Design an enzyme around this catalytic site. Structure first.
Site, PDB file in Angstrom:
ATOM      1  N   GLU A   1      48.535   7.017  46.146  1.00  0.00           N
ATOM      2  CA  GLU A   1      47.178   6.502  46.325  1.00  0.00           C
ATOM      3  C   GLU A   1      46.719   6.780  47.740  1.00  0.00           C
ATOM      4  OE1 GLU A   1      46.829   2.336  45.384  1.00  0.00           O
ATOM      5  OE2 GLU A   1      47.397   2.755  43.309  1.00  0.00           O
ATOM      6  N   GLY A   2      45.409   6.846  47.945  1.00  0.00           N
ATOM      7  CA  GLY A   2      44.885   7.074  49.280  1.00  0.00           C
ATOM      8  C   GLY A   2      43.473   7.624  49.304  1.00  0.00           C
TER       9      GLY A   2
ATOM     10  N   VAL B   1      46.810   9.599  42.078  1.00  0.00           N
ATOM     11  CA  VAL B   1      47.472  10.769  41.517  1.00  0.00           C
ATOM     12  C   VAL B   1      48.654  10.328  40.665  1.00  0.00           C
ATOM     13  CG1 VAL B   1      48.492  13.028  42.013  1.00  0.00           C
ATOM     14  CG2 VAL B   1      46.804  12.054  43.567  1.00  0.00           C
TER      15      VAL B   1
ATOM     16  N   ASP C   1      39.442  18.930  57.340  1.00  0.00           N
ATOM     17  CA  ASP C   1      40.506  17.938  57.495  1.00  0.00           C
ATOM     18  C   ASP C   1      41.878  18.583  57.298  1.00  0.00           C
ATOM     19  OD1 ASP C   1      41.845  15.508  57.839  1.00  0.00           O
ATOM     20  OD2 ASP C   1      41.128  14.668  55.946  1.00  0.00           O
TER      21      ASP C   1
ATOM     22  N   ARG D   1      49.247  15.973  56.089  1.00  0.00           N
ATOM     23  CA  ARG D   1      49.026  15.015  54.995  1.00  0.00           C
ATOM     24  C   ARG D   1      48.231  15.634  53.821  1.00  0.00           C
ATOM     25  NH1 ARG D   1      45.910  13.349  59.309  1.00  0.00           N
ATOM     26  NH2 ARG D   1      43.682  13.813  59.089  1.00  0.00           N
ATOM     27  N   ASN D   2      47.561  16.760  54.064  1.00  0.00           N
ATOM     28  CA  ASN D   2      46.771  17.438  53.032  1.00  0.00           C
ATOM     29  C   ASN D   2      47.399  18.732  52.531  1.00  0.00           C
ATOM     30  OD1 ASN D   2      44.653  15.546  52.808  1.00  0.00           O
ATOM     31  ND2 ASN D   2      43.699  16.316  54.690  1.00  0.00           N
TER      32      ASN D   2
ATOM     33  N   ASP E   1      44.888  19.443  49.402  1.00  0.00           N
ATOM     34  CA  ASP E   1      43.665  18.674  49.301  1.00  0.00           C
ATOM     35  C   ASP E   1      42.646  19.257  50.242  1.00  0.00           C
ATOM     36  OD1 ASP E   1      42.164  16.728  48.092  1.00  0.00           O
ATOM     37  OD2 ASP E   1      42.669  15.215  49.491  1.00  0.00           O
TER      38      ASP E   1
HETATM   39  F1  LIG Z   1      47.687  17.610  49.671  1.00  0.00           F
HETATM   40  C1  LIG Z   1      47.631  16.492  48.969  1.00  0.00           C
HETATM   41  C2  LIG Z   1      48.082  15.302  49.554  1.00  0.00           C
HETATM   42  C3  LIG Z   1      48.018  14.117  48.821  1.00  0.00           C
HETATM   43  C4  LIG Z   1      47.507  14.145  47.514  1.00  0.00           C
HETATM   44  C5  LIG Z   1      47.069  15.336  46.926  1.00  0.00           C
HETATM   45  C6  LIG Z   1      46.542  15.325  45.476  1.00  0.00           C
HETATM   46  C7  LIG Z   1      44.980  15.243  45.410  1.00  0.00           C
HETATM   47  C8  LIG Z   1      44.527  16.682  45.125  1.00  0.00           C
HETATM   48  C9  LIG Z   1      45.689  17.333  44.339  1.00  0.00           C
HETATM   49  N1  LIG Z   1      46.858  16.519  44.684  1.00  0.00           N
HETATM   50  C10 LIG Z   1      48.079  16.803  44.279  1.00  0.00           C
HETATM   51  C11 LIG Z   1      48.367  18.026  43.467  1.00  0.00           C
HETATM   52  C12 LIG Z   1      49.623  18.256  43.023  1.00  0.00           C
HETATM   53  C13 LIG Z   1      50.652  17.289  43.398  1.00  0.00           C
HETATM   54  N2  LIG Z   1      51.880  17.300  43.112  1.00  0.00           N
HETATM   55  C14 LIG Z   1      52.487  16.138  43.702  1.00  0.00           C
HETATM   56  C15 LIG Z   1      51.435  15.543  44.313  1.00  0.00           C
HETATM   57  C16 LIG Z   1      51.592  14.252  45.108  1.00  0.00           C
HETATM   58  C17 LIG Z   1      50.536  13.659  45.819  1.00  0.00           C
HETATM   59  C18 LIG Z   1      50.751  12.476  46.547  1.00  0.00           C
HETATM   60  C19 LIG Z   1      52.035  11.898  46.563  1.00  0.00           C
HETATM   61  C20 LIG Z   1      53.061  12.530  45.846  1.00  0.00           C
HETATM   62  N3  LIG Z   1      52.822  13.674  45.156  1.00  0.00           N
HETATM   63  N4  LIG Z   1      50.339  16.256  44.120  1.00  0.00           N
HETATM   64  N5  LIG Z   1      49.075  16.021  44.530  1.00  0.00           N
HETATM   65  C21 LIG Z   1      47.150  16.518  47.654  1.00  0.00           C
END
Ligand SMILES: Fc1cccc([C@H]2CCCN2c2ccc3ncc(-c4ccccn4)n3n2)c1
Length: 281
Positions: free
Chosen positions: A22-23, A28, A147, A151-152, A165
């Site tokens: 979450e955030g 997700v 950004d 973290r992204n 992200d």
């Molecule tokens: F660069 C970020 C940082 C944070 C969140 C994301 C999200 C939003 C856009 C897409 N996305 C994704 C896409 C695939 C994926 N595979 C695992 C995860 C994930 C995310 C958070 C925690 C653990 N695992 N994610 N997350 C991208």
């Protein structure tokens, strides 16, 4: 009306397993998807909390496809909530991944695909080179990421790293500006360009080589703004060879036009990655 064709996914085809995070990005989930690529497979699903922005985002995500952009598979808009579907990146966001492999790390990490504990210099360079490669692509399309920060970014099987992200938390200041990653021209003149992304990438480079420390973590948001606009630079990380620090410093030229291009930065990082300099102390 005309536009990019966005792939649609039936809802009974997505089985949510559990929340991953979450955030600022929303919620997700980890999920199984049938039938994406021919039988069943894990994906990450972003469920949107609250319509028009979604379609624009989906269109842009559809367009921006690259080896170092997290793979976007499409959307589900039949009933609420709206879903965006992505490849599953098993090691999560790059900032947390870095911290879990830092010297300070409280627990052991992994993963049958990466050793626990500190990363090799070659691995840190591979992480940096991959993020840069992603940024080269975006700059080629005149896409400006407002950004860029670890973290992204996301880390997948075998340490593949991708921008995760797009930005379409104490790392932000009250809009919310990721102020610690911003160049002087962004803070002072509210200008953000591809050259501004080179600056931010320099800060990403610092994040990587500190195993995910916050830039200026000792200081307040206004104190960090003072540093950035007065020309003080982040100090060389202990794990960072002088060659890599020179690259960071090239990113942090006050005048945008004297920063090296992201293409040049990536090229030097990839060269180092292929032949990592010996470094201790
Ligand atoms: F660069 C970020 C940082 C944070 C969140 C994301 C999200 C939003 C856009 C897409 N996305 C994704 C896409 C695939 C994926 N595979 C695992 C995860 C994930 C995310 C958070 C925690 C653990 N695992 N994610 N997350 C991208």
């Amino acid at each position: 009306g005309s536009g990019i064709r966005v792939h649609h996914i039936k809802r009974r085809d997505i089985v949510l397993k559990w929340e991953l995070g979450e955030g600022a990005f929303g919620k997700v989930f980890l999920a199984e998807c049938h039938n994406l690529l021919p039988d069943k497979m894990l994906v990450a699903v972003k469920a949107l909390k609250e319509r028009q922005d979604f379609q624009r985002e989906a269109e842009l995500l559809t367009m921006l496809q690259h080896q170092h952009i997290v793979r976007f598979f499409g959307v589900c808009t039949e009933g609420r909530p709206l879903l965006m579907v992505f490849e599953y990146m098993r090691h999560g966001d790059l900032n947390r991944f870095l911290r879990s492999h830092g010297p300070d790390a409280k627990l052991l990490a992994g993963g049958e695909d990466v050793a626990p504990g500190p990363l090799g210099l070659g691995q840190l360079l591979a992480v940096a080179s991959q993020v840069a490669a992603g940024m080269v692509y975006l700059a080629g399309l005149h896409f400006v990421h407002r950004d860029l920060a670890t973290r992204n970014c996301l880390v997948g099987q075998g340490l593949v790293v991708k921008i995760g992200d797009f930005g379409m938390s104490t790392d932000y200041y009250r809009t919310m500006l990721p102020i610690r990653w911003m160049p002087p021209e962004s803070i002072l003149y509210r200008k953000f360009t591809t050259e501004s992304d080179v600056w931010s990438f320099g800060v990403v480079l610092w994040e990587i080589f500190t195993y995910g420390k916050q830039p200026w973590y000792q200081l307040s948001n206004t104190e960090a703004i003072d540093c950035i606009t007065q020309g003080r630079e982040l100090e060389r990380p202990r794990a960072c060879p002088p060659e890599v620090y020179a690259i960071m410093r090239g990113c942090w030229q006050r005048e945008p036009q004297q920063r090296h291009s992201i293409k040049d930065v990536h090229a030097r990082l990839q060269a180092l990655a292929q032949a990592p300099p010996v470094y201790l102390d």
